[PDB]
């Protein structure tokens, strides 16, 4: 009885438990390995099958990153998001281990429906990583936002919260380069790239190629066209020492406020509220650009 | 932090009853209602939230 | 020998889930609505006819959840993915009764008659989820004609309390996706969905593709008014202009299926004037 | 089978201190840089989950052993014993969490993965501090060169807020000695370097060296502006501190 009850808690925490199957690949599957066979034991192992494997998909990705400095932006921010749902997976597993060992009951039909709200949650989360196994920040942002286009508002809120957090370096790349010109991308995982061509004294020369093949699905193309000149017009005032935010100083306070404000909430990617004040930056830097010559 | 706390109360959706941050809750359904002994069991529809 | 009558109870609680028994076979046969479960006879002919009596009640549920919970996940943004997902929710709660019955089976506290009196309202709930799943495969419906069918359900049929009760919730929860983008077309003049569900898909202001295959969720009278709005909303696209004039018809939300006519009329004269 | 499992719950707490265990036998290979554990054999196949409690604690001890090799052989007060002290402080706050579990372990509660929710914020915390400590010690980094590594960690660890909070806190806890030495140079005009604490090493015709064994976290260009504040006094906004020093002097 109790042996297969304790096996499936241990596959939830990793692989094995009391018997060997040892699936670190494949589709994970449970072999009871007993002389006591019944036909309901066959249906319980197929219950286990997509619970343990879909847990293993998160482990395959965050150990594929092996937390590193190469892709230490977006690529590993995505592993960061998946680490917040890693824990919660362990949590329904700790209240079931609290029932088992003294604080008793085994797994039953009760526990059988309890897990099925994780079950559908891990089909979304396993599908979210299957979508995008590339290692670029621009095409990660087009992949997980396209899995928000689908129906079902139970998983729309679930992915919306992953999507705010994949986006937490991405909008952190955005507004500093807009107000001042700041960069940290040496890998080119910022969808706006830099230095394909040699860097010479400005005269309006190239140092930004935004790449018409990798734009985040939450941004629109005619806006990425506007921000390209905003990055160029401020970096072109590196031939004067005024590197400040152009026109109003009320834009510079915003980036500093915003990075805590996004963390604190439910990890929501604002992609039409953000679009309002990046219009007002295009409007700022063009009268400023003519007023330093005036 | 809002998203983390909300998930955690329901224990990754493995609770439907009460919000708890204890990991010492016993997962059990309730005994049959008294309104469910006069007509038999009936599934509650979550209307008007 | 008397023990075996309780043993077939415990085998029954797995039929309701949709899975294998310990002495009652499950056949995941081709076709839906009716798959046959083969009950292995045991001595005492009376308790075998009795179980055979309760057997179709578990059967008609077990087919209909199965294909529609996977089919829904394959949907592109359409209202049938919000619909199939709401069924799965009501399907969790059916299984609460399965596990509450198994809680009373620690030693026998129930009989086959005591089970039936309990699933007596859930038999009227399951038979009205049964016709939904068949009607949307007959048409091979997409998102505009799905809602056309479900409309007549929430404004027809009576016989149980619990049947109409479920059927208010799920039909508003299929219409509610539709409403969220509805305010997006009737004010902003954009679609978010991959296939729009309205009278027209997107493109002087007659340059449209009229799909009748995807039509509005109600009677045609609001549908004529959804076309007229999109003409004002085309003019601003035709030569650029303030498209941020509507928001004072968005301080209040729409959200009606008992008077969709009023909110569409208020979405019409508001769009006529700002032009 | 439940009884053997709750024994190794009690033996893990002793291991996590960084010391001898009981039936969990520990052997340093080359001076606590790697330590092989030899777990018992049991009739439970939760042996895999045992081997998954080894690797957290792998990185535990190797922070501490690496940072004391610096600080006891030269007595660094510029960066390495500073970071040794920030890390001993995260070590006290580690060990009180070890005491928080031992209080609980004299009741029936904790078992294998009951503890692993305490292990999880701390795992992210110690794995980055250890991948930090490997590169400082064995990199051969002292003075500014250490700061320059910690600076690259702030960049690399934007993903994950918990990861970001540690290298923020380490890179400022490593600079609070090293900034003070440059401050008296640019404010007062006195410097003494006994361990070569700052880049400028004396010996007007005294030199204003900017060395690359203490390469700066900041631009090489703005380090010149440090240098030359001190020239005329010698016989985020931490770069403006130097510029407002620099306008005073010339």
Describe the protein's architecture and organization.
The structure is cut from a larger assembly and holds one copy of chain A (294 residues), one copy of chain B (49 residues) and two copies of chain C. Chain A has 294 residues and is mainly alpha-helical. Helices cover 54% and strands 1% of the residues of chain A. Chain A has helices at 2-13, 40-65, 74-81, 84-100, 109-114, 116-130, 137-143, 153-166, 170-179, 221-235, 250-264, 279-291, and strands spanning 193-194, 208-209. In chain A, strands 1-2 form a two-stranded antiparallel ribbon. The longest helix of chain A is centred in the N-terminal third of the chain and has 26 residues, at 40-65. Chain B has one helix at 2-9. The longest helix of chain B is centred in the first third of the chain and has 8 residues, at 2-9. Chain B is elongated and about 45 Å long. Chain B starts with a helix and ends in a 40-residue tail after the last helix. By secondary structure, chain C is mainly α. Chain C contains nine helices and two strands. Chain C has helices spanning 4-17, 46-71, 79-103, 112-116, 122-138, 143-153, 161-186, 223-238, 260-273; strands spanning 24-25, 38-39. Chain C is elongated. The N and C termini of chain C lie far apart (83 Å). Chain A: Necessary for the recruitment of gamma-tubulin to the centrosome and for the formation of a functional centrosome. Chain A: Belongs to the TUBGCP family. Chain A: It comes from Xenopus laevis. Chain A: It is found in: Cytoplasm, Cytoskeleton, Microtubule organizing center, Centrosome. Chain A: Interacts with gamma-tubulin.
Brief summary:
The structure is cut from a larger assembly and holds one copy of chain A (294 residues), one copy of chain B (49 residues) and two copies of chain C. By secondary structure, chain A is mostly helical.
From the structure above, extract its key features.
part of a larger assembly, 4 chains, B: mainly alpha, elongated, C: mainly alpha, 56% helix, Gamma-tubulin complex component (chain D), Gamma-tubulin complex component 6 (chain B), Gamma-tubulin complex component 3 homolog (chain A)
């Amino acid at each position: 009885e109790t042996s297969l009850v304790r096996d499936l808690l241990y596959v939830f925490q990793g692989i094995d438990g009391k018997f060997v199957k040892m699936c670190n690949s494949e589709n994970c599957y449970k072999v009871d390995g007993k002389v006591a066979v019944s036909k309901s034991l066959k249906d319980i192992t197929s219950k286990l099958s997509e619970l343990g494997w879909l847990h293993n998909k998160i482990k395959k990705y965050t150990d594929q990153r092996s937390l590193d400095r190469a892709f230490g932006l977006v690529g590993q921010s995505f592993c960061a998001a998946l680490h917040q749902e890693l824990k919660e997976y362990y949590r329904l597993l700790s209240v079931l281990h609290s029932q088992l060992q003294v604080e008793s009951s085994l797994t039953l039909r009760r526990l059988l429906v309890w897990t099925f709200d994780p079950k559908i949650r891990l089909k979304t989360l396993a599908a979210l990583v299957d979508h995008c196994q590339g290692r670029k920040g621009g095409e990660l942002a087009s992949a997980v936002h396209a899995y928000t286009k689908t129906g079902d508002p139970y998983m729309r809120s679930l992915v919306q919260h992953i999507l705010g957090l994949v986006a937490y370096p991405i909008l952190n790349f955005l507004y500093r380069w807009i107000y001042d010109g700041e960069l940290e991308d040496t890998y080119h995982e910022f969808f706006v790239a830099s230095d394909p061509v040699v860097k010479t004294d400005r005269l309006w020369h190239d140092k930004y190629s935004l790449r018409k093949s990798m734009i985040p699905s939450f941004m629109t193309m005619d806006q990425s066209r506007k921000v390209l000149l905003i990055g160029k017009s401020i970096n072109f005032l590196h031939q004067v020492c005024h590197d400040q935010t152009p026109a109003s100083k009320a834009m510079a306070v915003g980036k500093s406020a915003e990075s805590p404000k996004d963390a604190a909430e439910l990890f929501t990617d604002l992609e039409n509220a953000f679009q309002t004040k990046i219009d007002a930056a295009y409007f700022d830097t063009s009268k400023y650009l003519l007023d330093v010559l005036n | 932090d809002k998203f983390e706390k909300e998930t955690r109360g329901s224990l990754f959706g493995a609770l439907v009853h009460s919000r708890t941050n204890d990991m010492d809750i016993k997962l059990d359904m309730p005994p049959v209602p008294e309104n469910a002994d006069l007509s038999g069991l009936a599934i509650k529809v979550p209307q008007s939230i | 020998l008397p023990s075996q009558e309780t043993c077939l109870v415990e085998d029954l609680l797995y039929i309701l889930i949709g899975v294998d028994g310990r002495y009652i076979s499950v056949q995941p046969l081709v076709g839906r609505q009716s798959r046959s479960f083969s009950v292995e006879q045991n001595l005492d002919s009376s308790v075998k006819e009795l179980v055979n009596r309760i057997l179709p009640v578990a059967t008609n549920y077990s087919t209909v959840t199965r294909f529609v919970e996977e089919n829904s996940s394959f949907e592109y943004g359409q209202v049938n993915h919000a619909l199939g997902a709401a069924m799965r929710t009501l399907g969790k709660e059916y299984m609460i009764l399965i596990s509450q019955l198994e809680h009373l089976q620690r030693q026998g506290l129930l009989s086959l008659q005591k089970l039936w009196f309990y699933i007596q309202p859930t038999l009227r709930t399951m038979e009205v989820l049964a016709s939904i799943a068949t009607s949307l495969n007959k048409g091979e419906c997409f998102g505009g004609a799905t809602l056309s069918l479900l409309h007549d359900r929430t404004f027809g049929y009576t016989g149980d309390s619990q049947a109409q009760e479920l059927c208010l919730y799920l039909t508003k929860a299929a219409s509610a996706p539709y409403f969220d983008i509805l305010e997006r077309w009737i004010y902003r003049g954009i679609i978010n969905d991959p296939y729009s569900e309205f009278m027209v898909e997107e493109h002087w202001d007659q340059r449209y593709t009229i799909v009748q295959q995807q039509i509005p969720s109600f009677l045609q009278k609001v549908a004529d008014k959804i076309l007229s709005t999109g003409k004002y909303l085309n003019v601003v696209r035709e030569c650029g202009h303030d498209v941020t004039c509507p928001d004072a018809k968005e301080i209040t939300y729409t959200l009606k299926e008992q008077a969709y006519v009023e909110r569409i009329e208020k979405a019409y004269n508001y769009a006529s004037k700002v032009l």
